[model samples]
Target: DVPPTIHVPLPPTSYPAFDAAIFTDIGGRKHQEDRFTLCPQLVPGRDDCAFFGVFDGTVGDFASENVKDLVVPQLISSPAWQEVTEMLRSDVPATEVDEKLPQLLDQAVDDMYKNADNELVKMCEQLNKDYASSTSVTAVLAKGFVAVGHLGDSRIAMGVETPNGLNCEFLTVDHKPDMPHEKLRIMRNGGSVEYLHNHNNKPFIRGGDFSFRKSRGEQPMQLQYSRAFGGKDLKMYGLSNQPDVRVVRVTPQHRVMILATDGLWDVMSAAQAVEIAMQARQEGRNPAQALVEMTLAEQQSRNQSADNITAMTVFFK
Candidate 1:
């Protein structure tokens, strides 16, 4: 009688490790309303867990600053985060963790925005900052996967080394009022999208004024983005705080990840940004700083006024 067959799991393969850098410039803006976070290896004794983000404020820096500060603490304290740490402690394979953790982390990010909305509403009332609004793009690298969450126009892109050359993929999509689904939602919420004659006929959603006064009724605040955080007056008018989330497995070929405000995207394409990052890596320079400097120069050369610019780059080993 042979003993029952013993079961054993294969040893979990360790994927490529990574590090990150970030840079921000006020550009021609009066205030630096753009903020970024780069916490490489955030978890104790864990080199695999990391987080990074960029937030672009409109009207003022209040919203972006607060959201930038609020998200990390909330994410670390989340139940999904607890479960992730537990699995990592047990030596669960990164592949398995990637499968199970993406959707959970997606919910965790959703909760982050929901909690921020509540806190920002109260803060805006206390500080009398009725026009404080922000758009954000966030990336979390954990257990061999990258989960990206974004709202409004700020973007996240990844560049991977392929057989032929580097290939780029945009992890987040810009949320604009002209998008069919976004327009449908805004119209359903009793909001109207209008094209302004003064701003090159760009489509926008009208909200309250900068200093919102109940007595003045709703003024024509040019809310260009369909989604953002801390738009208290525009909440009912369909300026969504909800972010679109995407998860991608971090293969060995995954070389660089970039998160930047629209200031960079406005002047450069994702492919161009990826090539810049790859060159910087080859030259042993900081990719984020390179991208930021290039963006400022491009803005000047194009004869366009500067907007707040922030760039964060994560490079894998």
Candidate 2:
């Protein structure tokens, strides 16, 4: 497939007495990575709130594109959402509530996932063919709450204003093979890790042109997290069939929340992103503009030469 880049600028809507921004990029790849961030205006006479998200597609653009439409509506329509958030806010302190919110939020998130997956299956059936495998990472931000859901390598992070200063905290865990827990799980499930190393057993290099080959094949096997979407053919390659979803709550103390694909996190750390957001906010720049500029500058400076990079940043007033 030919490498292509797509940029979509959403129409500006009235801000709901809160300031926020969403930025995205499709970098150095053949497909236009799909991403969306929504900050709907609050109801004119209701206790309602808004939602925001970022959907990153890996194999085919369809998964992310479909998520942009399906996930949010599902969340807003869930019967338990209003009650859960309200009960959570009333029952526990902000600090303690974050710990309990995950269980309650997962119900809504799982419902969304199942619905979205069924919708995708219908779309595939209509098209009379299967699409490539893809991963999804999502986050929901509302009044005094932030919830995250993820499958594959996408992530959601929070940048909060602590007593000491700004801090970036990961709200979601990655499903990767390198983690000890993941390794054990993979091994127990009939997976193996064969090193691509020199005679001394040093791992192979990352960049181009560092070939030191004393090749020995000792059961070279793939190590992937056991949860993902759309990789039906490579089911034997240790790819997962389920997704890992997480939820977190945000109080007024939070500054920003970020949802991104591996394409962006592969090049920048959560701390670095927080620093950029802080500097931009201090300088009175729009958070969305700041996010895009910093990410583009980094991508160019580091010469991040592959993958479709995408990101969405949401700021709380």
Candidate 3:
């Protein structure tokens, strides 16, 4: 069953002193599971403080939806985050790593995965021993910092005003089969790439020779992505272990930040998104709303051919 699309207008209530907008919409799909939450002021003294996250799912929307409710709250409930910054600053070299940052940055990410795993286990246990799987990509924005946690192809990007003008910077990398490093890893683990010029190509499998079971002619599942969150049964098909976490300090000058699933990036580029966002910002429109609308328009204009597209845009005040 597909989910419905949602459109949010700017809230009428005063949003502290900080001014920001978020636009999330389901695009060209039957159902929508992509979830987002925004906390403009987490603490009494920090009105400028904010927290945001984007969760993307595959086989089902359960994982993404669960994270939306649990993950964000955990970050807020966490003890003083100042210690996180101190730990990173002290243990990690400035040139080598961001040690001057809060430990919550890493803790938050670890908690996201661990919590999700536990939640999935519980659901499976309740279901009488059935496994559940999903993928996620998340981002959190505080006073002057942004933290990112990812397990699949979903991504986060930041747009900064440069000397020439606004420039878009990729804060996360796409975990796809085309990446050389990912390809090499898959090959080392007894996998091979089977390029399909068209959609008719058969699926491939790795680790061992293809096999046929009674009533099942030939079954194969092969692909390579260095990392992902779920798909345990097909875990051998790609990298289903480990995660990529990142953090960056944000400032008033920061123009925009974006978090999206492969559903959108799979069809668009970071540069293209920036250009559209810049136009919206210049026109005095909500950047996030504009991005969501434009992405949907683009997908419809091109005749979307893939899964549901989900995205979020954040503009600094």
Candidate 4:
């Protein structure tokens, strides 16, 4: 029997105190391109300010690992970070900071994307081939700012303690060719998009062509996302590295954040995930464990299955 679709509400913006957990499974595939981080950052006034990211690598393993290696170090040295730090020290009003921070973060994320892309090309040359590259979504809860940056489909969602119940909010938007804006961008940039299946029989929006984007990897026109780090071929057709970045002040009501790769996204909805996470809490299991176990079960329901599954849950209570 086919499973019916369900929806739910949905990161890391504070030094949360609730138990945290993470889970990853091979899900019948030999390699997992998905990776994540839960490391604290060096920021003023907060000892627990941390960094979070999910790298969704495609085509191969090299790209995701490269992204994982590059993100944190590059973040500190990127021009965007310098600009942000410089601006922050200038003593602007909170409202001004609110107005400007998002812009800086957006540029910073974009800059990092471009930087990573350049490095990937060099690395690919050295390796004679790359494992492809990654699409990234990152978040940081530092110095009273909840900044979320996104490229491609891996996601970060937040759950808030509302008077009625825990409300879900999406912190990062997924970027795929199915998104009209993305499709338009690709088309305008001289590329095309179409639906296709991989050897694994997964549905993906394939775009780009050899004439426009000169790629080193095997596939030259079968990418799913409009923004990815290692689409050397697609890059010629206007596939972007710039991520949509959102910055806001975290409030007390926000309680938890969920980070995951498309493995979980392919089979589960936000609402279902939240229910499972809390259920895990009730069962004395970590929310991520609870979430992945149920997700695997759900995937196998009636005999369906999935790619690699990774689930990370952070509590802010």
Best candidate according to lDDT: 1
> For residue 64, what is the lDDT in candidate 2?
66
Q: Where does candidate 4 clash, by residue pair? A: 8-271, 9-168, 10-158, 10-168, 10-169, 11-257, 62-131, 63-133, 213-233
Q: TM-score of every model?
A: 0.87, 0.71, 0.72, 0.80
Which candidate has the top score in TM-score? 1
For residues 11-122, could you state the per-residue lDDT of candidate 1 as single tens digits? 1112337656677788998998887665655567777777777888888788887877677776777787777668778877767766778877777777766776677767
What's each prediction's clash count?
0, 4, 15, 9
CA deviation > 4 Å runs, candidate 4: 1-19, 83-103, 196-221
Clashing pairs for model 1 are none
Model 3 — TM-score against the truth?
A: 0.72
Rank the candidate models, highest TM-score first. 1, 4, 3, 2
Report the Cα lDDT for candidate 2. Answer: 0.57
Looking at model 3, which ten-residue stretch has the lowest summed lDDT? 1-10
User: Lowest summed lDDT over 10 consecutive residues: which window, candidate 4?
Assistant: 1-10
lDDT of 4 by residue, 208-317 (tens): 45533345544454676778777665676657788787876667887677888888877777777777777777677668867777777887884765687778787765
Candidate 1 achieves a global lDDT of 0.77
Could you tell which candidate, 1 or 2, scores higher by TM-score?
1
Task: List candidate 2 stretches off by more than 4 Å.
Answer: 1-14, 37-48, 76-79, 82-103, 125-131, 178-226, 232-243
